[PDB]
Amino acid sequence: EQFHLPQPFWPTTKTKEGEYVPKDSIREASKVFIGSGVLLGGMHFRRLMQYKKGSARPGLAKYLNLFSLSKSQLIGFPVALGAFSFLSHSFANLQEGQTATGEFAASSIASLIGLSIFRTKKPLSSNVAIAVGMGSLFGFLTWAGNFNLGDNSYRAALEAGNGNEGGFDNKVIKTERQGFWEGVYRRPLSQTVEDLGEGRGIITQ
Amino acid sequence: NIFNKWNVTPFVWLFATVGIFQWDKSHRESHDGKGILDFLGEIKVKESLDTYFKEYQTKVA
Amino acid sequence: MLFTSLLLIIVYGSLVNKSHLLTKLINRLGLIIIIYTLLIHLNINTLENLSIGINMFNNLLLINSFNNTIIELILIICILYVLLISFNITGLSIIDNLNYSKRTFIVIVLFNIIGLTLLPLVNDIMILFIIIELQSYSLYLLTAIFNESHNSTKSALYYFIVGSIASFIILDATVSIYDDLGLTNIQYILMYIDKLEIFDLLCLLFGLFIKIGLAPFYSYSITIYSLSPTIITNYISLMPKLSILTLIYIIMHYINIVNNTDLNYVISFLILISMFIGSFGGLNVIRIKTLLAYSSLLNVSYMLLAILSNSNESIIAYIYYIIQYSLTHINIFSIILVISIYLPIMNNMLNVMITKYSPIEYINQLKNLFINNIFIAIALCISIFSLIGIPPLTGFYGKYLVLISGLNNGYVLLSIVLIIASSISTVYYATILKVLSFDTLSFKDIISNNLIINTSPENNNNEIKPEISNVISYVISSLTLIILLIIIQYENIVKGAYLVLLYNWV
Amino acid sequence: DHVRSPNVSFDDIDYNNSQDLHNAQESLLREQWIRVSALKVCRKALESCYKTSGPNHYEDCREIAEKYLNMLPDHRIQGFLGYQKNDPSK
Amino acid sequence: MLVQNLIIFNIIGIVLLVLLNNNNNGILNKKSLLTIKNELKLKQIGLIISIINILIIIENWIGFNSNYYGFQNIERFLNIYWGIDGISLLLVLLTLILGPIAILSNWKNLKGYYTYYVISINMLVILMALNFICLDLVSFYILFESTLAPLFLLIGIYGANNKNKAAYYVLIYTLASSLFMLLSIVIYYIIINSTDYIYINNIILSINLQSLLFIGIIIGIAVKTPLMPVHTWLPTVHSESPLGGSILLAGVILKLAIYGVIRLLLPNLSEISMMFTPIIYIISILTLIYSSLITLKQTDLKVIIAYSSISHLAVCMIGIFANNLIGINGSLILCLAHGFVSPALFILVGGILYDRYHNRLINYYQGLSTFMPIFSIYLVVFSFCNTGTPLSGNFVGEFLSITGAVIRHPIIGSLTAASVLLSACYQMKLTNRLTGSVFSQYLHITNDVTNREIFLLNWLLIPTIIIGIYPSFVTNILNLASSTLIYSVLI
Amino acid sequence: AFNLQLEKEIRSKIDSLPKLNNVTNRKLSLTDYLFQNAANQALYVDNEADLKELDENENEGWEKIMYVGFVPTMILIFAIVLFKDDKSIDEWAMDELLLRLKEKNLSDVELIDELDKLSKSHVGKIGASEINKRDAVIIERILNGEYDQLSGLKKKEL
Ligand SMILES: CCCCCCCCCCCCCCCCCC(=O)OC[C@H](COP(=O)(O)OCCN)OC(=O)CCCCCCCCCCCCCCCCC
Ligand SMILES: CCCCCCCCCCCCCCCCCC(=O)OC[C@H](COP(=O)(O)OCCN)OC(=O)CCCCCCCCCCCCCCCCC
Ligand SMILES: CCCCCCCCCCCC(=O)OC[C@H](COP(=O)(O)OCC[N+](C)(C)C)OC(=O)CCCCCCCCCCC
Ligand SMILES: CCCCCCCCCCCC(=O)OC[C@H](COP(=O)(O)OCC[N+](C)(C)C)OC(=O)CCCCCCCCCCC
To answer: Is C276 in the pocket of ligand 1 (CB under 6 A)?
Structure first.
C-alpha cells in the first residue's frame, strides 16, 4: 500500500504499451553536434574576416567582441548541445516518454560537461551550482508542458466535449474517473478511498 | 486617596455589569424570556434570509 | 476629413509668417481636425453594422468591429497627445517653446494618423506594403523633426535603417506568398491558407515584430526612446504599437485556421525571451525613459500572449489591455513633462548635462515630488501601481484578462513566466516610488528657493497663480481617476468588449 | 419561536437547485448536532451514576458506560461535504 | 447596508481630510489652524472615523442570526456580492477595533505628515475588513493585494533606518507569491466560468487539478501567515515599519492567511486538503519549532516579537487544517487572541521603550522594574498571555488547536504540544532579562507609562481575558459556520 | 471664541521679550478653523509656537474621543455578547432533542409532567446541578431512544 501523495502534474497524451517507437539517440545527437559545430565554427571564421575588413573603427570592434567566442567555447558549446541531445533522447527511451526528471538530468549533466570545458578557471562547485540551475529550468520547462499544452489544454478539451459546457448533474455518477478539466457534482465513494485511503475519517473514524 | 480615579473605575464596571445583569434577569420574566436589548432590533429569520440567498444564487448562475 | 484638412494646413503653414504663436494656433487647428475626424467616424461607423466586415475600395481595405475599435482609440489618444503641443505643459517659455518651434510638427502627426488608422484595415499584400511604409516614413520624419539636435538626428538615422530592414522582410514575405499563389488579395489568399507555406506569414510577423521592439530586436527601441526628446518619445513609443499589434492579431487570426503548432512555438520562444529582457533589463538603469522602454517591451509581451492565443477571451483581453495601457502611457509622460519645473538649479561632481529636449532624464530627478506636489506625486504613484498590476487598478484587470486567455489556450509556461517577470519588474517600478516619497519626512523641513518654478515672475502678489496650466493638469486628473476608479464601471466596459467581434458571429 | 430542521436528503434533490442543496446541507448539519446533544445527555447520566454509586460504579453504570464508548466515535460533527460529494453505493 | 455604508462613509472621510489639509498648499507660506499642535484637529477627525467604522458593523451584528446556516446580510455593490457568516463577523470586528488603537499608537511619535498617515491607516483597516465579506475569489484577491500600495508607502515614509529594505521585502514577497494564487483563481474562472464561493464549493475537480490549484493557493497563503521557509520578510518589516503598521500587520494581515484557508481551500478543494494535511503539519511543526529556537538568538527587541508571531500562527495553521471542530474553533480563537496580545507586545517594545530611548538592541535594557513599575506589570502579564498561560484567550486557542491536532493526527500532531515549552523559553528569557538585575547603566531615568499608553495596553488586555475566561462569546457564533468546513464520510 | 484682542495682548508680551528659552482662558471654536481669514489666523499660530517654547503628557486631544466614542462602543459589544437573544446551534439542538422527546412519547404521562415544569432557562441544564428539578425520566427516555434522523437523510449505503 503506497502512500497517498498529491500529483500536481499537467495532463499529457499517453501512448499505450507497445507504442512509443524509440528514437535513435546517436543519429539525433550527431546532427546537433555537427550542425552546431559548423555554424559556430563558420561564424567564427566570418567574424575574423570582419576584423580584417577594418580594425581602426571602434564601433565595429565593440560589437564583434561581444559575439566573439573563445576557443574553449567553440569546442564546449557543440559538445554540451550534443550531449544534451543524446541524454534527452536516451533518457526518454528508458521511460517510454519525456519527463521533467529526465530533462533535468539531461540538462544538468550536459551543462556540467560543457561547463567543464569553457569554464575551467572556476571552482568545480561553482559549475555544479550553475548546472543544477540550468537543469532545473529545463525540468520546469517540461513540467509546464513545453511552450504549449496542445491538445491537453482546456480549449482542446472544451471542443472535444471533455469540458464543463453542459453543466453538472448529481443524479449521474460515473464509475470512471472524470477528465482533467471536468468537474462533477458528486463522485463515487470508491474513488475517494483510492485517492485518500481509509483512515482519518474516510469510512472509518 | 483610596477612592481615586484609578481605584473606583474597576468597581464601577462590576456594579454596572451586575445591575444590568439583574435588570436583564428581571426583564426576561415579564417578557417571556426576551432580553433587555430587544429595543435595538430582532434577529432575522431563515425564511427571509433564504430569499436573498435564492436570488443571489440565481444571478450567479 | 484628415486628408482634405491636411492639405489646407500644409499650404496655410507655408504662407503665414514664421512665429511661435502662429505655430501654436495651427497646432490647435490640428486638434480641431482630429476632433472633427472622430465625430465623422463615429457618425457613420457603428459596432453592430461592422460586425460582418465590409470591403472597401475594390476589396483593398476591410473594416470590421475589431478594426473599428482600434481606429477610434487611435483618434482619441492622438487628441490627448496634440493637447501637449496645443497648450502649455509647464507655462515657461524656456521649456515650452520647443514644441512651438517646428511648424511641420502637426503636419507630420496628421500624416502618421492616416497611416496608423489604415494599417489594421489592409486587405491586400500590395496595400499592406504601401501603408506600412507610409506609417514608417512618417515616424522617421517625426523622430528627425528637431534637426538641430544631434541625438534626434542620430536616432532617426538608427530608426530609418532598422525599419527599412523590417520593411524589406515584410516585402520579402509578401512577394514569397505571391510567388506561391499568384494572388494579392488577402481574402483570396485565405482560400489557399492550407496550401501556402505558413512560415512565410511568420516571416511577415518577424518584420512586424521588429517595428514594435520585440526581442531579440529590442535593442534599437530602447536606444531610440532614450535619446529622443520626451515629447517625441511619448508618441513614437506608443502609436506604432496601436496599429501593428492590431494587424498582428488579424494575421494570427488567419494563421490559426491551419493551427500550425510549430508557428506557435517560435512566437512563444520570442515572447519568453522578451519577458526575460523586459524584466531583468530595467533593473540596472538610471534613465527614466530607458526604464519606460523596458516597461514598454514587457507590456507588449503580455499583449502578445493574448494575441498568440487568439480566442474569444483574447479579443476581450487585447482590447481592454491596449486601451488602459495607452491611457497609463499618456498619464505617465504627461506627468514627466510637467514635473520638470521642480528641478533644482545649480548655483560640480559627475558633470551631469541636461538639455532642453529632455529636462527629465534620470530617475533621481523625481526626488522630493511628494513634497513639491503631493497631488501630482500620487497621480504618478497610481499610474506606477497600475503598471505593477495592483488591484483594483486598470493594470490588474489587463493582466487578469491576459492570464485568462493564456491559461485557457494552454500556455502554462508563458503564464507562469509572465508572473515571475511581473514580480521582477516590480523592483524597478518600486524604485520610482521610492525616489518620490521615501525621503519626505527628512526633507519636509527644507528650503528650495532654487527650483525652476521659482524663476517665474508673479503677477500682483495677490492673484492666486496656479503652478500648472488648466489643460494639462485636467488631463492628468481625469486619467488618474479613470485608472483608480475603474472598478465602478468595469463590468459594463467588459460587456462592450464582449460585443467586439472578429468574424465570430455564432 | 423554535424553528425546526427542514428534513431534506442529498439523494432526493438536484444539486442544480441551489435552494434544495442548501436545505440538504443544513438538514445534515442539524441532525449531527442532535447526536452531540444526545451524547452530552448520556454522559450526564454516566457522571450522575458514577457519583452516587461510589465503589459500585462498575456494576451500576456498566450499560451506560458501554453506550457512551460506542456512541463517542461517531456522535460528533462530521460536516456535509463528505456525503454531498460522495456516493456510498458506488 | 454594510459594505455600501462602510465604503461611502470612509471615502467621504478621506475626501474631508484631503480638502481641509491641502487647501492652503498653494505656496501660501501660511500657518493655518488645522496644523496647530502637530495637526491635532486632523488626527482627531481620523480617529473619529475609525470609531464610526466599528459602529457600522455593530448595527449589522444586531441582526446576525447564529442559528442560520449560510451567508447573511447578502448585498450587491460594485457588481460584487457581499455576505457575512459566523467566521467573517468576528474577524471584521477585530480589524475595525485595531483601527483606533493603531492611530492612537502613533499619536505624537511621528516626524510629520499625520494626515497622510491617518488616511493610510483607515484605508488599510477598511480594505482588510472588506476582504472578510467578499463572496468570490476575484474580489478576495482584489482586496488581498490592494493593501500593498498603502502599506508600501507607509513603511517607506514613516519607517526606521532600514525602511527602504523593509518596503521592498513586503511589496515583493507578498506580490510574487499572491500571483501564484491568482493563477489558481484564473483557472477557476476558466473551467467553471465563476469564482463565487457557493458555486465553486459544490464542484469536484480532478485529483491532479486539485493538487495544482492547492499548490498555487497555498504559496500565497504560506507566505502571508507566514510559514517557513518563506518567512524571512516578516522580521525585517516589523523591525522597520511604524508602530501602527506593525499593529495592523501583526493583528490583521497575518490572519488573512488563516481566513484564506477557510474560503479558498477547505470547502472547494476538500479532497486534496485531506491529502495535503500531513505535509502542512510537517511544515507548520518545523515552523513552530525552528522559529522558537531562532528567537533565542535574536538581539533586536522588535525582531523577537516578530518571530513570536510566526510560532503562534504555526499553531493556527495546524489547528485550522485539522478536520474536526475542536481544531477549527481553536485556530479561530487563537487568531482573535493573537490579534490583541501581539500588538501589545509591539506597543511595549516599539512604542514605549523605543519612543524614549530610540534603540532596539537588547543589551541596553535590564532591571526596568526599578523605575518603570507600571511598564513591567503589563510586560509580565502580556508575556504570560503570549506563552499560553490559562485565563488568557491564547491558552484557549492553543489548547484546542493542540487537541484538534492530536485528534487529526495522534502521532505527529502531538508535537504541537512543544509550543507550551518553546514559547515560554524565548518569551520569558526576554521578560526575565528586562525586569531582572539592577537598572541598566546605559539608560537615564525618565517617565513611566503615560495615560495614552495605559489606555492602549488595558483595552488590548481586556478582550484577551474575556475570551480566555468565557470563550463561549466566540464559540457560539462560530459553531454553525465552522461545522461546514469538515469533510468526512463515516459509514 | 477667537478673541482677536487676546492675541494682541499676548503677542505684545512675547514681543516685549527679545529673548526666548533664556492664556489659560483661551480656546477655539469649530468655526475658527474654517471661517477665520488669513490676518487673524496667522496671529494665533505665531503665539502658539512661542508660548509652547516658554515651557506632563496630558490633554493630548484623544481623551474625550476615546472615552465617549470608543469605550461606550466596547460596552455595547460587551452588552451584545451578554444580553442578545442568540440561539447557537448546540443550544438549538438541545431544545430540538427535548421537543422530539415529546413528539415521540406523547402517551407517556410521566414524561409530559417533567417537560412542562422544566423551564426554558433550565432546559439546557439537564443533569446534576444546583437547581432542584425532576428530569430523571427525561434522561431515561433519551438513554433508550435514538431521536436523531441522520440515517433518514442517508438513503444510500455501501
Ligand atoms: C550564436 C549566435 C548568437 C546567439 C543568439 C543571440 C541572439 C538571440 C538571443 C536573444 C537575446 C538577444 C541578446 C542580444 C544578442 C546577444 C549577442 C551576444 O552574444 O553578446 C554576448 C553577450 C555579452 O557577453 P560578455 O561575456 O559580457 O562579452 C564577451 C566578451 N568576451 O552576452 C549576453 O548577455 C547575451 C545574452 C542576453 C540574454 C538573453 C537571455 C534570453 C532568456 C534566456 C533564459 C530564458 C528565460 C526563461 C527561462 C525558463 C524557460 C523555461
Ligand atoms: C524560499 C523562498 C525562495 C524565493 C526565491 C526562489 C528563487 C531562488 C533563486 C536561486 C538562484 C539565485 C540565487 C543564487 C544566485 C547567485 C548569483 C551569484 O552568486 O553570482 C552570479 C553568477 C556569477 O557568479 P559571480 O558573479 O562570479 O559571483 C561570485 C560567486 N562566487 O551568475 C550566474 O552564473 C547565474 C547563471 C547565469 C544566469 C542564468 C539566467 C538564466 C535564467 C535564470 C532564471 C530566471 C527565470 C526568470 C523567469 C522570468 C523571466 C523569463
Ligand atoms: C478607498 C478608496 C481610496 C482611493 C483614493 C484615496 C485618496 C487618493 C489621494 C488623493 C488626495 C491626495 O493626494 O492628497 C494627499 C493626502 C493628504 O496628505 P497631507 O499630509 O495633507 O499631504 C501633504 C500636504 N501638506 C504637507 C501641506 C500637509 O494624502 C494622501 O495621499 C493619502 C491618500 C493616499 C494613500 C495611498 C496612496 C497610494 C494609493 C494607491 C491605490 C492603489
Ligand atoms: C514563491 C514565493 C515567492 C516569495 C518571494 C520571492 C523572493 C523575494 C525577494 C525579495 C527581493 C527584494 O526585496 O528586492 C529588493 C532587493 C534588495 O536587496 P536588499 O535587501 O537591499 O539587499 C541586497 C542589496 N545589497 C547587496 C546592496 C545589500 O533587490 C533584489 O533582490 C532584486 C531582485 C529581486 C527579484 C525578485 C523576483 C522574484 C521572482 C518570483 C519568485 C521566483
So the answer is: yes
